[PDB]
Amino acid sequence: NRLLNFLMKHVFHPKRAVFRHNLEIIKTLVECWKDCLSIPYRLIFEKFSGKDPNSKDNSVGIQLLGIVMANDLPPYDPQCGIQSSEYFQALVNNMSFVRYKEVYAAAAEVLGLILRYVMERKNILEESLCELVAKQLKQHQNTMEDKFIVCLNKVTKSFPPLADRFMNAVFFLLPKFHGVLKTLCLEVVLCRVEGMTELYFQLKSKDFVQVMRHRDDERQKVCLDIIYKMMPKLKPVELRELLNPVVEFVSHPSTTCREQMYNILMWIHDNYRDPESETDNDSQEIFKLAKDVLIQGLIDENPGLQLIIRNFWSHETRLPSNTLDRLLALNSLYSPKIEVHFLSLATNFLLEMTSMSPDYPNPMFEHPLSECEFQEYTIDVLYRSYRHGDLPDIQIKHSSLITPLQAVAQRDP
Amino acid sequence: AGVRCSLLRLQETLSAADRCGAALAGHQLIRGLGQECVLSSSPAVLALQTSLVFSRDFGLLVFVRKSLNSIEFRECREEILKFLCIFLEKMGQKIAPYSVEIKNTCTSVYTKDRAAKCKIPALDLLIKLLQTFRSSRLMDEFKIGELFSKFYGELALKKKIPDTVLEKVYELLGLLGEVHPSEMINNAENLFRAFLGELKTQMTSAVREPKLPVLAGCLKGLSSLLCNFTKSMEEDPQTSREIFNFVLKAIRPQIDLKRYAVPSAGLRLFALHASQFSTCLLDNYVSLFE
Amino acid sequence: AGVRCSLLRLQETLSAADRCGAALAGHQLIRGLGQECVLSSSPAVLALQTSLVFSRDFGLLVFVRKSLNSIEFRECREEILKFLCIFLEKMGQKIAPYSVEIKNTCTSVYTKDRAAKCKIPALDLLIKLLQTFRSSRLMDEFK
């Protein structure tokens, strides 16, 4: 503990690389000796406090307690204090930066994690905490020019039952643009809460369509996760048009977002209750427009995302077991946009019932005319569908014959 | 068709701003908007204005509710809300259906200091809604919970706001204490907790000068709450005479300016519910009639 | 196609500003524009940048030449012109054809006093044109 103490006084080093070495070596120290150390909080009172025009009065030591949560260490084993609350509000007062390089705060990413800290193990401080913290957090937005979105964004996924008072007034005030900040507010909306029922009148405004594809890859997934998390109660008159650009996110570059697309579609087909063919309901349009993308989604270049639909279509959802009904269903599965690959996909779907057969321990004739053989080779992308049997490689389980058929069939028309 | 089409075109044309950096490039177009909207003075043009301006795809209020990077849009609010405030009761027979959209339209962000130019009408528009729509279905229904959450949080902020919005907060809390239905019979008691000491604080305890707006707001808030919880059962000699003397103390002009709302709360409650406090008259003399 | 498409998307996405009244709401997006344009250091990405940025339907220079209510756009010039000034000779082998459009792009209005932040590069861009294009047909012809 006293060896730690000096670093606890002096973790700071102007060189960032040696700072990372210091953080990593203390991490290893607490990773090996976790059962021989304790944590005196008076040593850390000033590791977060201070008062300067912008920052770092008596504190750069923030990763100190960040290591505590990251590696499974309970807090407040030593006793608390009536004014442990200043440890919160003083760092909240560190908002007033003018920093030019996308950090936005020395106000801790970790500071808000008290709600996570003290929920499973109950200490009563958080209840008096939250009210005043929120009071000053709503107040100091007009203190000096800096943003308080991060003061919710980095504390997201912490105490969901009360994580929604902010939106109650922010929605009238900071619907988001501006790139990275837009993604931060997306991650802000990612919190799951009941606090909104009539908000879909916002999406009754159109342009949540082109903004969906503003910046590539993972940034925009919360936009579709919006519909994902509000699926159960909807009457999707407008998801008709909202899924139309999603028809074109096959055309729009993404892979993880396309996976979320496919999950959305898989829920849709099952959960408008497709077999519930009500004579009068309006879902007939969305039936065919959803099938319009559900069929073609197999064309996507990600082989894993191809398999995630290959196994999906093979469930009892649409594809039966009876052979000729199976032919008709796949016959019914044609779409004009899949003609390039239809042959390979048809044979792929057909041969899976051969891929599962209990007669595999029954090779063709099995009569032992020859003696034995085995071998394996590998020299660099490769391929894998080989195996050796009881007879020479002449006679193998039937899989060795069927599997290369569809393997080549996916390639040569 | 000249009369109707003239205003129709003069409104449809000026449906987009060009707010940029130039000489008074953030106020003049909105000034023209207001000064051309004011010409509407006939029932036909009033109906046309209520149809166009209170639309959802276009109009002043739509982009007022959509302009949120609104530092230089504070002047736009300064013009439009201060015009529509007088507009809603100068000629307001036609506009029944869209007071809910007006309530959706009002909004609030500002610097904490001495002034910002929309701190007068920000809740005064809702005060005009209170005056205009009274006992009707336009109220007691539409999300009074959001107001008594956010503005109760505003009162618990304890005077971290300037004068102009603090008056309006006290006044609107007092008047929302009059809309009885469906909410907050249990939270109504907290009003006295402040209104007992703060009214004494404002006016004659010279720690802070008896300037008119804070006094008027505190009195108006303190007054409107006794519209219900009738004092035919209890508290007539407790909370209907020792705040009534406070009402008398506030009605007399602490300075000769004697603005509208400084005595208006007391006289309004006198005209409305003087029938509630009645045991006081057994000894109270009415010789103050002169 | 990752190398080319990364810069292509990072330029095409950030093709519109939202200049309004907020905390530093007139400088940060343009700073990101400049700091993402600077990553172009190979001949292929340099050609792609010269094709995209020096277009007429989109690019920094088009709206620089079109933003004229430009009080808060002086910071946009302060960033973009001071970046393109170094950009034109740090890596300028590819950009022959559009120096005339650059000459069309420079422009001038300011307060008469001690400073305004675009008074350094306003004609220094034309000075770089003088240095870059010397005796060539890009000069002695264009107005």
From Swiss-Prot, chain C:
Protein family: Belongs to the PI3/PI4-kinase family.
> By what name is this protein known?
DNA-dependent protein kinase catalytic subunit
Q: Quaternary state and partners of this protein?
A: DNA-PK is a heterotrimer of PRKDC and the Ku dimer (composed of XRCC6/Ku70 and XRCC5/Ku86). Formation of this complex may be promoted by interaction with ILF3. Component of the core long-range non-homologous end joining (NHEJ) complex (also named DNA-PK complex) composed of PRKDC, LIG4, XRCC4, XRCC6/Ku70, XRCC5/Ku86 and NHEJ1/XLF. Additional component of the NHEJ complex includes PAXX. Following autophosphorylation, PRKDC dissociates from DNA. Interacts with DNA-PKcs-interacting protein (KIP) with the region upstream the kinase domain.
**Species per Swiss-Prot/TrEMBL record:** Homo sapiens
Q: Which of the residues bear the PTM N6-acetyllysine?
A: K112
Parent-protein start and end of this portion: 6 to 148 of 4128
| Functional description taken from the UniProt entry | Serine/threonine-protein kinase that acts as a molecular sensor for DNA damage. Involved in DNA non-homologous end joining (NHEJ) required for double-strand break (DSB) repair and V(D)J recombination. Must be bound to DNA to express its catalytic properties. Promotes processing of hairpin DNA structures in V(D)J recombination by activation of the hairpin endonuclease artemis (DCLRE1C). Recruited by XRCC5 and XRCC6 to DNA ends and is required to (1) protect and align broken ends of DNA, thereby preventing their degradation, (2) and sequester the DSB for repair by NHEJ.
Compartments (UniProt record): Nucleus; Nucleus, Nucleolus; Cytoplasm, Cytosol
Please describe the post-translational modifications of this protein. Answer: Autophosphorylated at two clusters, the T2609 cluster and the S2056 cluster. Autophosphorylation induces a conformational change that leads to remodeling of the DNA-PK complex, requisite for efficient end processing and DNA repair. S-nitrosylated by GAPDH.
Disease field reads: Immunodeficiency 26 with or without neurologic abnormalities: A form of severe combined immunodeficiency characterized by reduced or absent T and B cells, recurrent candidiasis, and lower respiratory tract infections. Some patients show dysmorphic features, severe growth failure, microcephaly, seizures, and impaired neurological functions.
